[PDB]
């Protein structure tokens, strides 16, 4: 068998990226061998969270009774080389027919969970939107996906960049520093972050004194030299794991000192940086974070676990390292699967102990139910607004404390007069 494939009455696509590789020119039109590249522990954890969710639903005799959920999952380390997997999900015979109707025609899968990053989604989503094939992303935070008319069958189980940027602005307004540097990844995620940041601070006392696109070619000596010359104390770093690590590692090496760092929720629960040698010297690290949401049964599931782009090559893996990895986006994966599973259940007009078998399921039928999702899950209420954004999930403020943990020191109030509160006593500057 394989981790990446599970047969079932209905299939869910799973789009993950559990290896990392920098973009490179290529000379042939062919998939990349992602299994020989850099392993990403926390992404593999979210990969397992989907496998766990499906298995849990298949163990249930009340949700989808006697109707099994299968999946085809992929490790797309390159968004541009992800199309073979995407075609597989959308094909009706290991064939794609470009003019095929949204109604008549039964694709391999009924919907797809993922992908993780905005870049991955932008490359592929239009092909899915065409026949209203539902995508429920567990990670995509680009604000442009809130535009229904551009992304009619795209939903997500995480917050948009606007929410996190509001929280970050909230953190800054709570203290006294008003010059700010903004280091953002040179990609769709980071650039949307920068625009939202500029928009939010424009009519405020906050001055954006320096900003810079972070990419593989970044000369960090000059970045920090420019920051230091402008006497900037607050540095926002809006960037995924690889770029956030490069920034912070470089700062340690270049003797950057006495700063106030602010992380987005993509690296404020990073597990490598808080115990890295010399981390203490760069100053204080604050962040917006996803609260740790406990997923009962997952620990047990993990002990018991350990076509192109369906190979892990991760066999000598420490169960403990995987368990303790950045658990961000966990409930978003879990809810994304459950949302599709409920949508199928209701589309089949399943009852309590059996589902009818006279109903033919089309992806756009799954979409209609998904949009009116309304169900409880680990005591949260899963729903999406008109734009397909989640109406669940909160954000908290964290401070990297002396024992290497991301201590909760505050929370972000989506709807209240003081939008962000912080117990300032907990922060040891």
């Amino acid at each position, epitope marked *: 068998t394989s981790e990446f494939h599970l047969r079932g009455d209905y299939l869910i696509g799973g789009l993950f990226n559990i290896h990392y590789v920098a973009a490179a020119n290529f000379q042939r039109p062919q998939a990349i061998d992602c299994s020989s590249k850099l392993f990403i522990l926390p992404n593999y954890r979210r990969f397992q969270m989907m496998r766990f969710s499906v298995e849990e639903i298949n163990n249930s005799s009340s949700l989808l009774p006697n109707v099994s959920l299968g999946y085809q999952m992929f490790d797309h380390c390159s968004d541009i080389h992800s199309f073979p997997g995407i075609f597989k999900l959308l094909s009706v015979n290991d064939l794609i027919r470009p003019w095929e109707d949204a109604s008549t025609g039964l694709p391999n899968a009924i919907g797809v969970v993922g992908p993780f990053t905005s870049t991955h989604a932008l490359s592929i989503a239009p092909i899915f939107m065409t026949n209203l094939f539902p995508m429920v992303s567990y990670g995509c935070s680009g604000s442009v996906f809130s535009k229904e008319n551009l992304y009619p069958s795209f939903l997500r189980t995480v917050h948009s960049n606007k929410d996190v940027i509001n929280a970050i602005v909230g953190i800054i*307004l709570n203290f006294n520093w*008003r*010059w700010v540097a903004f280091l953002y990844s040179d990609d769709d995620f980071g650039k949307d972050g920068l625009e939202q940041f500029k928009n939010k601070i424009e009519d*405020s006392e906050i001055c954006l004194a320096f900003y810079k696109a972070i990419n593989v070619n970044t000369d960090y000596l000059q970045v920090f030299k420019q920051i230091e010359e402008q006497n900037i104390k607050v540095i926002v770093v809006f960037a995924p794991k690889v770029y956030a690590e490069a920034v912070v590692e470089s700062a340690v090496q270049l003797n950057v000192t006495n700063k106030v760092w602010i992380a987005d929720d993509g690296w404020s629960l990073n597990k490598k940086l808080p115990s890295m040698n010399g981390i203490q010297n760069i100053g204080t690290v604050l962040g917006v974070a996803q609260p740790v949401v406990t997923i009962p049964g997952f620990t047990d599931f993990i002990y018991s676990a350990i076509f192109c782009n369906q190979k892990c090559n991760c066999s000598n893996l420490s169960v403990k390292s995987l368990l303790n990895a950045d658990p961000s986006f966990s409930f978003p994966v879990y809810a994304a699967v459950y949302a599709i599973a409920h949508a199928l259940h209701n589309t089949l007009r399943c009852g309590s102990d059996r589902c009818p078998k006279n109903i033919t399921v089309h992806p756009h039928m799954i979409l209609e139910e998904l949009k009116k999702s309304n169900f409880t899950l680990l005591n949260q209420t899963v729903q999406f607004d008109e734009n397909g954004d989640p109406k669940f999930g909160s954000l908290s403020v964290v401070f990297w404390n002396s024992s290497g943990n991301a201590e909760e020191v505050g929370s972000y109030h989506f709807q209240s007069s*003081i*939008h962000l509160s912080i117990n300032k006593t907990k922060i040891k500057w």
Partner: antibody, heavy 124, light 112 residues
Framework: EVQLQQSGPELVKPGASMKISCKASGYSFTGYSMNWVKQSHGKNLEWIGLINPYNGDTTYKQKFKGKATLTVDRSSSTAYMELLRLTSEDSAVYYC?????????????????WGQGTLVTVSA | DIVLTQSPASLAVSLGQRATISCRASESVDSYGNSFMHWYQQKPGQPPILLISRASNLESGIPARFSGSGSRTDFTLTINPVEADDFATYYCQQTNEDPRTFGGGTKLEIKR
């Protein structure tokens, strides 16, 4: 454009208290400190303190601690200063003034917008 | 607390001529590579108006006739040429450290 509109002149008895208002319009209210300034008949200008209307944090000049109390009402975009236990020494014009944009810290901000000022007469 | 002393306490300057006004701080008002001394103009019965921030930066709206210079503890406001409506009291203000303080002001009279 930005307007700060203070409440009108007030006569108040010695010993009483009173609350001056400053209604802000034409900008995002929680984005900037609101400062308060005292000017006695001798015309010396004197910083009373400021409030962060985002969260209500206050910073006072020491002699006005327990004499002045700054608050905001975010729902009406209005800053308030309450003066306590008035003496004839509190007779003065009081201004509100918004911090500008460009200073490195809330401490270093200069005053770009001013209310028209509120004359307070403390007499029996 | 930073004490600001202005001089002269008052001066009279003819239409078309140069007004020089200085401000001395008891301690340096520099930080962040800037000098945090500002100049304000006030007419009787009116709120002060900001002329110059950070020693020498002219606020928009304010005539080029006004300019400032200095750093650390010594600062100067120049009005040139003086016009008839420039009669006012001029105040320096330091914002380098809490509490913000103002000088006692310099009263400019138009000479005729």
């Amino acid at each position: 454009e930005v307007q700060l509109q203070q409440s009108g002149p007030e006569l108040v008895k010695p010993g009483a208290s009173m609350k001056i208002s400053c209604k802000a319009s034409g900008y995002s209210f929680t984005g900037y400190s609101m400062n308060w300034v005292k000017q006695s008949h001798g015309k010396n200008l004197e910083w009373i303190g400021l409030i962060n209307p985002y969260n209500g944090d206050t910073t006072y000049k020491q002699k006005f601690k327990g004499k002045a109390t700054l608050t905001v009402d975010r729902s009406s975009s209005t800053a308030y200063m309450e003066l306590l236990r008035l003496t004839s020494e509190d007779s003065a014009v009081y201004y509100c003034a918004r911090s500008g944009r460009g200073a490195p810290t809330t401490t270093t901000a200069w005053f770009t917008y001013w209310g028209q000022g509120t004359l307070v007469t403390v007499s029996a | 607390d930073i004490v600001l002393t202005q001089s002269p306490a008052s001066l009279a300057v003819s239409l078309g001529q140069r007004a020089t006004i200085s401000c001395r701080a008891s301690e340096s008002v520099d930080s962040y590579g800037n000098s945090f001394m500002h100049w304000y103009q006030q007419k009787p019965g009116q709120p002060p108006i900001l002329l110059i921030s950070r020693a020498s930066n002219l606020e928009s709206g304010i005539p080029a006739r006004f300019s400032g210079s200095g750093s650390r503890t010594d600062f100067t406001l120049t009005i040139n040429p003086v016009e008839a409506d420039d009669f006012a009291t001029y105040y320096c203000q330091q914002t380098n450290e809490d509490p913000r303080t103002f000088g006692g002001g310099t009263k400019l009279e138009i000479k005729r």
